[PDB]
Structure formats: structure tokens, C-alpha cells
Design a protein around this nucleic acid. Sequence first.
DNA 1: GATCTGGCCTGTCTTACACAGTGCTACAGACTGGAACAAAAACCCTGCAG
DNA 2: CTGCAGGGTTTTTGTTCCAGTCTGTAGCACTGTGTAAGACAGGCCAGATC
DNA 3: GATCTGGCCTGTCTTACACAGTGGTAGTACTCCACTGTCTGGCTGTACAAAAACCCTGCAG
DNA 4: CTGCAGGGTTTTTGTACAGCCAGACAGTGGAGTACTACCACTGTGTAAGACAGGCCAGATC
Lengths: 154, 148, 155
Amino acid sequence: NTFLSCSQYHKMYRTVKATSGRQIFQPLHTLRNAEKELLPGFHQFEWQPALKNVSTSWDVGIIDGLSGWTVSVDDVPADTISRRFRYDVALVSALKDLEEDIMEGLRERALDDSMCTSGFTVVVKESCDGMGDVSEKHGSGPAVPEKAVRFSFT
Amino acid sequence: NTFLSCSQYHKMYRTVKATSGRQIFQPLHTLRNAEKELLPGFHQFEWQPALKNVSTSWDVGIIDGLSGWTVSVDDVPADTISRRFRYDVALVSALKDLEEDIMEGLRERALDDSMCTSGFTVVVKESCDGMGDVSEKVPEKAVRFSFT
Amino acid sequence: FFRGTGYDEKMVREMEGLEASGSTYICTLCDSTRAEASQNMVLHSITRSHDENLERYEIWRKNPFSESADELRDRVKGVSAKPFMETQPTLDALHCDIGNATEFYKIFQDEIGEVYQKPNPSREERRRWRSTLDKQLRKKMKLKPVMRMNGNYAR
DNA sequence: GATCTGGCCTGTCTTACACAGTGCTACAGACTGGAACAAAAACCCTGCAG
DNA sequence: CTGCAGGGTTTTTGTTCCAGTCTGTAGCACTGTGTAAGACAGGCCAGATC
DNA sequence: GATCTGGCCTGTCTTACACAGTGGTAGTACTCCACTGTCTGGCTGTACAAAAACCCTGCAG
DNA sequence: CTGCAGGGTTTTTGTACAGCCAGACAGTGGAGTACTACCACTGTGTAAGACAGGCCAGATC
Ligand SMILES: [Ca+2]
Ligand SMILES: [Ca+2]
Ligand SMILES: [Ca+2]
Ligand SMILES: [Ca+2]
Ligand SMILES: [Zn+2]
């Protein structure tokens, strides 16, 4: 939430560590470990029926966006840089994030919990716009750090 | 030591104070005058004899370097931007900062502490250099003059 | 006690009223000429001092001997401009390091090819010996070149 | 049948304007005390009530 | 035995006064950055022309 | 029209100037799990003596 | 009024009985762990001046 570094975090960490007698912040690696569940690709799940032409592998995290674009020069170039998830894995991550509030709302709605297993309709908005010719530092020889497009949902 | 912004610091502080606080970090306003010990223009001092050609006010902090260049566009233009200190104030700040270390070293050598208050000699290194290709946000240049 | 030491060459010579920089007078300390500095190399005395440079500059201005351009240039041993910031008689550590580094860089680019065997090489062969030196520094020692060699690349 | 021209429409500059951040600061709005108060929260307690 | 109307009881939660006294945050000045609207260029096809 | 010469051009050699900072990875030197039985030293009900610095008092001047 | 010493009070200071639980010391085997140091990685040329070569053009006789 504060855009701090990895290094700088550890710096001020060792600082407060030797400062007043306690391990007030956790160091890096334990923060990394604790976080790795908050990313996509941690919760196991299923689909009924099974997915259409989708690998049932779940625990995967970040994929490379080219989707196995055969890099051979003869064909259309395959240099296009891209990153994404498995859409569905991102969805299950987002949903299990919100599960706390869904459980709160079920508490308010007083619906019995042995009756809240099937009838859920999540409405999902999605969006896709491009941010053009972005400015970024230390380019004296162009490396296409300009035209980006961000796929998103809510 | 880690290049954080004001808003940066306030968010961090407000956050860590919300949870398990028991406020820990200090608010911004308090630092905004707590630093005044470490800046120039805080510590009393003087010279015998008095310095030549120097206004003897010991409390001025940051000063524009132009030194009251008459803005008359008739004459040579006063456009070049600068900021500096008054050497003496800088030196007294740095020295009275070293106060801790010099008293420590005085005690380590077991030399007396009440007397021997008159023969201190300080060799100070100065160093200056320009800075090329400063991405500007006047050409792209700048010169920094420091000392140690 | 103040010491003006941490200035690069260009600034030192510029503020002590020297002819910046690679002119017939090179050393900020010993006033021997350039070519003479190749005949003798080790035996020299350090003389250059602030106040005496002010003396030599006053001589340059008044011209009390009515000598010509070059004779006066020599009589003051090359002091044209009036210095104003006093500076200690010493060299820098860093960029002497970088200068020796780039000097050995050049001589390595030279000896990769032939120099005692080639009286005057051409630009193409110079860049080619550079290129094979860079490939050698990459295959062995894992050193790609940079635009100009800084302190780390010099070490 | 070969050629001149208005409209137009796609592409291109520009450039005005919004946002973004960052240190100062000014303020408005939170916290402290005594009296004193109303006025329910929840137990309990009677009471007219079946 | 049961039902609430509603009595007692402390507790809570306000709460009225001024002062503060800190604080966050919304100013404020600022200039650097990214964009999209709009001017306008030109070429170029259709319409008018020779 | 032959000759000459200062000033200009090309090529030269030398001194500077950006390249930090950020995240992932790894070896490695430094530190608590449970299990233990034991000891010292603070705590505590009053009564007992010992220092300290003043305030009055008394003798002395 | 001066300076000082028996007594005085009042307060601390400490030792005195006695019992009691908190806090550490050794025991181990390592497993972890924090920490510091590693990687990979952008990009591959410039700007100023001094000097000797050569020429060449502007003026001359
Ligand atoms: Ca868009
Ligand atoms: Ca847009
Ligand atoms: Ca430098
Ligand atoms: Ca530099
Ligand atoms: Zn020398």
C-alpha cells in the first residue's frame, strides 16, 4: 500500500529490529511465505461439469502470455511481451478473498448455512483499455516501453 | 534513510498505529520541528576575533546563494538558481554533531575533561564537482560543492 | 586547517589558472613541458603554490620584461588566468585510477594487434582489435564493455 | 475520352487542460472537568390479571 | 401454573462549559506528464470541366 | 602571372559524463522447540537500630 | 548577631525474624532463520579544448 521496496523494507526492518528490543515487523522471507497464499493459484476447487478445453491444473500461478507462440523467425514474430493468469484461477482467488464478506452477508440475511450451497450468481464486470506511450526512466535506446494494455475485472 | 514521502510516512504511521497501537512511529508534525536540531542554525557559538565581512547572526538556516543580486535586468541577469548555507553555521552544526564522538575520544585517551578546552585543531576536507546530464524538471547541468 | 583536494583535474586546473587541460603544461605540480616529461619521468620537485601563482599572474599582467607571447608563456611557465580558489598540491585518487585504466585499455587494444610492427594503423583495425578484446573479456572474465570504464570496471 | 476542382475525410500536430505528487500550514475538529441529567439494558419484582 | 404493564436498581451514554492541544487534511504553490479535442493538411474521388 | 603567408580544417590526443536500484536466490553464521531439577533473590506481616540535615537551644564571643 | 554541639523530630536505611514464587542455568540436537551477500539486468557514444599538417586564399610585386 506504500510502494516501498524489497530492499528498503528490509533496511528499515533491521533498523527497528536493533532499535527497541523486539521483532516488531516480520522480515522479508516470512512475509513472502505468508503472502504466497494471497496470490492466485493456492486454493483447490473444482468445476461441475469439468471445464471446456481447460487444463484441470489449479495450483499454477503466473503464466507467460504468449501461450506457447512458436518463436521461429519464419512465422509471424513472437516477441510480444505479456503476462496474465489462468482467468478462472484469478476468479477463485478473488472469490475466496471476498468470502469473508459473503459470510457476513449470510449472517445478516440469516439464511441457514445448510441452505447456502448452490444459489450464487456473481456478476462480473470486465474492462480492457490501453495506456499509450508510457514514460519510464533510463531508456536511451528504445525497448517498446511505451504502449501497454491492461485487461481487468471487478 | 529510505526516501519516503510525507504522505508515505503518514499512511505508514496511521496504519501501524491503528493496528496494535499503542502508537509507535512518530507523527509528521513532531518531526517537522524535531529535525531542527540537526539542521544548521541552532547552536550558539562565536569567534575570537570576530570574523571579517560576515554578519554574525548564528541562527540563519538555508540561504539563497545569490547574495542579494540586484535584479536589475539592465545589468547582468540574476537568473541562476542556487541554494547554500553559511559555512560557519554548517561547520558548527557538523562539529556539534560530532560532539558525542569527540567527547568519547577525549575520554578514551583519559585526557582531562575540565581543562584542555582550548587547543582543538580540525583538519577539514573540502570537495566540489559538477554533475553532468542531470535530467531537468537553464541547461541540464548542476554543480554541488560539499565538504567533509 | 583546510585542504582543497577533492577536485577533478579539469576544475583544479581551471580554478588555479591553468591551460585546461592537455596543453604543453600538464602537471599541476612540476612545470616541465609535455615532451620533456617523456625524457625524464621520476626526478622532479613539487613547486606549484597558490601565492606564487598569484606572483606569476601579476608578472603575466604587468609584463615587466616586455617579452613576447611565447617567451612570457615560458617565463611564467604557463599561467594565464588569475586563480581565485586556493587548492592543495595533490592529485585525485579516483580518476588517476580511471586514467591508468583507460591507458591500459588503449594499450591492450593496441597489442592485440601489431603496433611496433605497424607504424600507422587505421581506424578500422583499431575498432576491430577493440571488438576482439571485448569478445575476449566476455568469453573469459565475463566482462562486457561499457561506454566508458568507471571505477568498478577499472578495478 | 483526358483533365480541373470542391468536399471530404483520414491522418497529423498542438496544446490546453486535467492530473500528480510534495513540502508548509491553518484550521477545524477531535480530546480533557464538575453537575446533572434523562433515559433505556437487563435483572428482579409487584400487580392486575387468565 | 402462566402473560405483559411496568414499579424498583445500577449502569451507560449523553451531556452541558469552557479552555485548550494535537492532527489530519485540505488547502496552496508549483511545475512535470498524458492525454484527447480540435485545427488543418492533403490527397484524392466525385463532380464539373474541357 | 609567380610567390608568399596567416588563418582556417582535419585529424589528434586528453580531460570530463551518465549505470543504480530492485527484485529473486543461496549459503551460512547465529538462535529457540521440548524435556528437564535447582538455586538466588526480589517480594512480605512488624520491631530494631543507624544516618542526615534542619530547627531550636545553650553556652560561648 | 557570630560558630558549633548535646539534645530533639522526622525521615530514611538497614538489618533484622519468617516464607514464596519468579527467573535463570545446565542438558541436546538442529532446525530454522535472519542476514548478508550473491545473481540478473538496463546498454553499447558523447562533449570540450590543444596542436601540428596541410592547404588555400587573399594580398603582394
Ligand atoms: Ca483509451
Ligand atoms: Ca483513453
Ligand atoms: Ca567529476
Ligand atoms: Ca562525473
Ligand atoms: Zn610534475
